[PDB]
Paper text:
The [name] [name] protein transits from pole-to-pole within the cell, accumulating at the pole that defines the direction of movement in social (S) motility. The N-terminal receiver domain (RD), a 258-residue coiled-coil domain, and the extreme C-terminal tail of the protein are all required for the dynamic subcellular localization and S-motility activity of [name]. Here we show using atomic-resolution crystallography and NMR that the [name] receiver domain (RD) displays the conserved switch Tyr102 in an unusual conformation, lacks the conserved Asp phosphorylation site, and fails to bind Mg2+ or the phosphoryl analogue, Mg2+·BeF3. The crystal structures of the mutants suggested that the observed conformation of Tyr102 in the wild-type [name] RD is not sufficient for function. These results support the model that [name] contains a novel ‘pseudo-receiver domain’ whose function requires recognition of the RD output face but not Asp phosphorylation.
Numbering used by the authors: 2 to 123
Write the structure that this text describes.
Amino acid sequence: SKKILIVESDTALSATLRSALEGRGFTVDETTDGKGSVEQIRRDRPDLVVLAVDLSAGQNGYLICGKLKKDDDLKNVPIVIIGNPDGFAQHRKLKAHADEAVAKPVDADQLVERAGALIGFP
């Protein structure tokens, strides 16, 4: 099994991305709750996280990414950020950063290809 968690408060986008990944054979869960996502990942470990920058409630995805990538037990989980590419180069400068980053508006097919490249197609 290849398990993905989508952390995204845009529920329409999340459903489309979930469906594309599911069609390709991934198991996918979704959460809009950025605050709860790190502990959700700890207790229900996915193979990959798709993480939006623009989260509701003043959260941002690069911060959630940093929390994951600073945790020695969770840092090995690959993360694909989805958001405005104007932030991607700066994020590459951090010690703790996402494995990859894909622009919004998201090309769903390309996101699926990156998932497969990162964790294997199931």
